[PDB]
Each structure stands twice: as C-alpha cells, then as structure tokens.
Design a binder for this molecule. Structure first.
Ligand SMILES: *[C@@H]1O[C@H](CO)[C@@H](O)[C@H](O)[C@H]1NC(C)=O
Lengths: 177, 217, 12, 180
C-alpha cells in the first residue's frame, strides 16, 4: 500500500497491588505510538504527556462530569472488572506438563501452565545443578498458557523438578538411560 | 427456496418478557428514506454514512464487498433505523442494508405488491404495499407490511403482542424466504441485533413478489 | 456479572 | 512490593483502513475482543463467557470517539503518519514434538506497527488452512503490537513449515521456518 497510516490508540489501564488494596488507573491516549495525554488516578486530572495533548488536557479538565467519572474509575471500572474476572483470570491455575528428553544435553520441557510464576530445577543424584543449566525464559503461548524449557549440560538419575502455584507439591520427572 | 418454519423454530412472544414497544418502534411511522443520495463517508469499512434529515445515517452491510459497491453510487435508502446502539463519527441514527441503486430502478408510477395475512391460518386481511422501484429490498417491503399490521392488526403493542408467533414470507416464483417477526426470548430485545438480518441488502423484483404473513394467536 | 468499558474521552 | 496484576482495555483505530479494535488484556493475555461487524464479544477462552458478559455495543462507542480523535490528532500533527516498525517473527510448538502426536505450531509476530499484517502458513511450500487460528492484535507496553498464529499439525519427518509474514515495515515477505 502506498497510502500512509494514521493510528489512534487508547489504553485504559488498571494496576492492582495486594489484591485490590491499592489500585491505580490510567487513561492514556497515543498518537501513533507516542502518548500525548493521560489521566492518572494519583494525579486526579488529565496531564499533557507531550505538547500535542495540551488542548485535550485543558479541555477534559474543564469537565466536572468527565473528571468525576474518571476519578470514580478506580472503583467502578478497575475494582469492578477485577471482581468480574477474578475467578477465571486472577484465580486461573493450570498445572504444567513436564517432559524430560535428550537433545550430552538434557531438556526439561514444562508446558501448558498458568500463571507464569514457576520454578524449574535440575537435580543430579539428588543434588541441584546451577552451572550448565540454561533456560528459555517464560514463554506466553498466547492462550492463557505458558511454556518454559530448561536445558542441562550433562556429564545417574537426572530429575527435573517443577514448583507451580497450581500444585500442592513439586512435580518431579526422573530420567535415566 | 427456504425451508418454511419448523414446529418450534419461530419465536413465541409469550417467552419474551421485555417491552414489545422496542420492536414496535422499528415498524412505526418513523424510518429512513433517502431518495437520490450518495454516501458522505464511513466509520468502519463495512458501513456507509449518509446525510439524510437525525442528520446522519450509518448503513451497515454484511461485508465490505457490499459497502464498496454502494460507496460512490447514487442510491435510494430505505430502512428501519434505531438510535440506541447507534455509534459512529463522521443527530445520529443507524440501520442495516436497505440500499438500492437509484438509476434504472425507478418506475413511472407506484407498483402494488399483494400481502396475504393469515391469522391462525385464516386469511382475514389482504392489502397492497406500494413501491416505485424495480428491485426493492425485502427490508422495505417488510417494513411497509409490518407497519401496516401495527397500525391495523395491532401487531406489536407496548408490553406484548396479541400474537404468539408470526413470520413474513416473500414468494417470488418458485423461490421464497421468510423472516421471524417475533423477538428472541428473554427480558431484553436487541434492536441492533434484530435489524442485522437486513445487512444482506437482499432485494426482490417488485413485479414478481407476493407477500404472505403467517400469524398465530 | 459484567465487564465494564471505560469511555474514551472525546477531543477538541 | 510491585503490581501483581494489570488489566488493560486497549483499543485502536487506523486510517485509511477504517478498522479498529477493542480488547481487554490481563497480564499479557486477551480476555476478549469485540467483533465490530457481528457486534459480538469474542472471549479468548470460551469458558470465560460462562462467568462474565460484556456489552459489545459499548465497544463501538469508544471506537467512534477514537476515530474522531484520530482526525483531530492527524490534523494537529500536521499529517505526520506512522513509521513502520517491522515484526520479529518466531515459530515454536505448543509442546515438545513427537512423531504422530498432535501439536500446534505457533507463529509469534512481535513488536510491530501499524497493526496490519498478512500471515500465511506454508507446508512444503503450499499454503495450509485446516484448523488455523489467530489472535487479535495484542498491545505491548512500548505501544507496538503482538500477534499469535496457530496451525494445528501432526509432526512428521516428511513436512517442513514456514510462517510467511507480510508487513509494510518489511521489504520482502518474512519467512520463519520449522522442521522436525
Ligand atoms: C496483504 O495482501 C494484500 C494483497 O493481497 C496487500 O495488497 C496488502 O498490502 C498486504 N498487507 C500487508 C501488510 O502488506
């Protein structure tokens, strides 16, 4: 396409701390990728992020009803939606499927778990391994599921242990040849 | 041809607990009618906006293909509009389809289309619906037909309807299709989702159509 | 239960 | 401590495409987006719909405002358009691959703008479509986009795959390979 693009972007963000003890709400407008105005619940008013947002900042601020709604957002928008999603998002817990296989390099694949918080450890003869271990990091599969790969450079029982919120105890997969 | 209604297919108004007034307003005196008109712009790629005096009218289509065909053409717009779920930016109103090309579609005089009304199988009323178009949208004919029925057979009332089920069948030769005239079940009637059945912009030959309304009380 | 949308501020 | 959770209502409107998007994000994942045509709430996981609802009609109220704001900002920036940022394409599988055991090929298109892309999966050079799916344009903190494409497949030592990505930030269609 020859035609140039013009994108407008708006993000209403809700940041939660300690459950919903603290909540912080943002109303951000982006020209292309550059934010020009924002409402921060901690500021209580629209602030021009760049000079482009000045007209909007001043204009929106002169609206008692708009400000009232945004100032109420932390409770009516954020805490409300957190309540509606709470059970299937905040509470979602899917257990990981662990698989150990040789690539001597040993690979421990931990797949399909939610949330992302996980602990994957390699043990050789019941003793942990720090050196020689490589991780791929958290990988979001884009479907409320994560995957992680942990490789161990091997020179004997090799156990890949996984700690995840969805489990009462660690997942161990012991491998030999 | 479309397979006529099955024993439990049609919607029973008794199972609708919301206000039938929301269905009635769609087929009341008010509606959209533009004659010789061209689109003024769009909101989304599948719709067209017209300045008809609301002051602006958003017309949604089933797909882009459709909106493209009508973007730069001089068309005739006729449709059952709504105001509630109506959002767009170019007073505002919205509608689906009901767009027909002006040129070569006009008739010198009004052509009448016969409508046979069957209340509980008994043809007690029959009337004519008129149009000055060659190809006319089923939507226009549907509106005209139901509109006549609102103000004569009390088709739709403020709370409920005096009829349980009802459908309007458009017969054109050996081919036919029908629309369910009753709201979906529940305490809410979604006007927008209801009129969406017209985004097909389906047209019929006025010289060949025959309308039959099958009501059940 | 229903998710609520925050309105987008209209500009000038 | 810091944030435990973040829910983001992201929406965008693009000209001249006259396309928009309205979604909800939770820690990187899409809760749902609104199908502007069908005016229907599409949950990422169907199960979500068994617990929550969203008035899809609402979404378009936001997009209309965004279209209006875009016009204002476009005129206000003196018609300064977007700078194309090419995608980082990576292909991986859902779980470790084993011959004859069902898996999913994930094509991750990351860090790009504008949010217009053309992704096609090729198996041995020919396009494949059976069971393919894609997410919607997902937002990033740097205000660029993310997208996921899925291709359910049955692993064999026979077939090779390619995720062909087309984006105006790229000169020639990007091809990210995958073979057993
Ligand atoms: C996608 O394909 C169409 C042609 O089929 C092309 O004209 C358009 O530019 C493509 N999109 C991108 C982002 O290149």
């Amino acid at each position: 396409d020859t035609r140039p693009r013009f994108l407008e972007q708006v993000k209403h963000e809700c940041h939660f701390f300690n459950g919903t003890e603290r909540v912080r709400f943002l109303d951000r407008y982006f020209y292309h990728q550059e934010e020009y105005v924002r409402f921060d619940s901690d500021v209580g008013e629209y602030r021009a992020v760049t000079e482009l947002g000045r007209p909007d900042a001043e204009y929106w601020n002169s609206q008692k009803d708009l400000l009232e709604q945004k100032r109420a957002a932390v409770d009516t928008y954020c805490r409300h939606n957190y309540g509606v999603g709470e059970s299937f998002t905040v509470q979602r817990r899917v257990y990981p499927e662990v698989t150990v296989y040789p690539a001597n390099l040993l690979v421990c694949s931990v797949n399909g778990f939610y949330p992302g918080s996980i602990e994957v450890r390699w043990f050789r003869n019941g003793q942990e391994e720090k050196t020689g271990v490589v991780s791929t990091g958290l990988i979001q599969n884009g479907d409320w599921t994560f995957q992680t790969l942990v490789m161990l450079e091997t020179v004997e029982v090799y156990t890949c242990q996984v700690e995840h919120p969805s489990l009462t105890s660690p997942l161990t997969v012991e491998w030999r040849a | 041809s479309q397979p006529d209604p099955k024993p439990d297919e049609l919607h029973k108004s008794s199972k609708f607990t919301g206000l039938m007034e929301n269905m009635k307003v769609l087929y009341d005196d008010n509606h959209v009618s533009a004659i010789n008109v061209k689109s003024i712009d769009q909101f989304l790629y599948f719709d067209l906006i017209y300045s008809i005096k609301y002051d602006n009218v958003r017309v949604e289509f089933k797909n882009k293909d459709l909106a493209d065909k009508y973007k730069d053409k001089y068309v005739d717009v006729f449709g059952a509009n709504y105001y509630y779920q109506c959002y767009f930016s170019k007073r505002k109103t919205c509608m689906y389809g009901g767009v027909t090309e002006h040129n070569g579609n006009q008739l010198d005089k009004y052509r009448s289309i016969t409508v046979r009304v069957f209340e509980d199988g008994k043809n007690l009323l029959s009337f004519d619906v008129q149009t000055n178009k060659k190809k006319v949208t089923a939507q226009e004919l549907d509106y005209l037909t139901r509109h006549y029925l609102v103000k004569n057979k009390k088709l739709y009332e403020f709370n409920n309807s005096p009829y349980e089920t009802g459908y309007i069948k458009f017969i054109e030769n050996e081919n036919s299709f029908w629309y369910d005239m009753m709201p979906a079940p529940g305490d809410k009637f979604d006007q927008s989702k209801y009129l969406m059945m017209y985004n097909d912009n389906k047209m019929v030959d006025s010289k060949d159509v025959k309308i039959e309304v099958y009501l059940t009380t | 239960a229903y998710m609520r949308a925050d309105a987008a501020a209209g500009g000038a | 401590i810091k944030e435990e959770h973040v829910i983001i209502q992201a929406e965008f409107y693009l000209n001249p495409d006259q396309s928009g998007e309205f979604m909800f994000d939770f820690d990187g994942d899409e809760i749902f987006h609104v199908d502007m045509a069908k005016k229907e709430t599409v949950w990422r996981l169907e199960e979500f719909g068994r617990f929550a609802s969203f008035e899809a009609q609402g979404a378009l109220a936001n997009i209309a405002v965004d279209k209006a704001n875009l016009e204002i900002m476009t005129k206000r920036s003196n018609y300064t358009p977007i700078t194309n940022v090419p995608p980082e394409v990576t292909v991986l599988t859902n779980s470790p691959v084993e011959l004859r055991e069902p898996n999913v090929l994930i094509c991750f298109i990351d860090k790009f703008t504008p949010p217009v892309v053309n992704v096609t999966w090729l198996r041995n050079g020919k396009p494949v479509t059976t069971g393919v799916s894609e997410t919607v344009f997902l937002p990033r903190e740097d205000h660029l986009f993310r997208k996921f494409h899925y291709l359910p497949f049955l692993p064999s030592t026979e077939d090779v795959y390619d995720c062909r990505v087309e984006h105006w930030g790229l000169d020639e269609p990007l091809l990210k390979h995958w073979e057993f």
